[PDB]
Design a binder for this molecule. Sequence first.
Ligand SMILES: [Cl-]
Length: 203
Amino acid sequence: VLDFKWYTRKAESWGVQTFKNWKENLTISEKDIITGYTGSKYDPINEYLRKKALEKIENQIKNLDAALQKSKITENLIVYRRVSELQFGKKYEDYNLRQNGIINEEKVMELESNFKGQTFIQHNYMSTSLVQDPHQSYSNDRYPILLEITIPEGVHGAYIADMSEYPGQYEMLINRGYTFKYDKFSIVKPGKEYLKVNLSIYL
Ligand SMILES: [Cl-]
């Protein structure tokens, strides 16, 4: 399993190299929509459901789907994604997993009880980073959960950092529609504490 940890230079070198030919075979519309996605207020699936406005969104989806279906990750890979408690559903907005930098142990035990061994469908495209916590937009300061995600060789995703509005996110964009399993819950101490949640793809 390839895991770049905090090694931004090695990760960038691999991501640019291994997705170079994919990128050069993208259409003008596909490149435009990838970049637009990285700077957009809304997730286009979430938006398509919420809503010339509707033409724009359907086209975004057609082009993102087409782009990502052309890419296959070449190695088993670890990627990283910071999220809030909303990960577990809308009702978890106010869960208060973390107070004053400290992860609440009994709340971790409750999440583990409710979710360990269960799956969820990631309906939206899934933005992740090739290294852990590279960018302040998706930081440990704001987000009390780090998803540490194991991706098998062959999954449809692509390194898009040099096309992004925010290249320093070191983004691996994973296609929409994959199912993921909650495998492990662990508290990581420094500096705020966080909850590390290991996920795997469930094909
Ligand atoms: Cl906090």
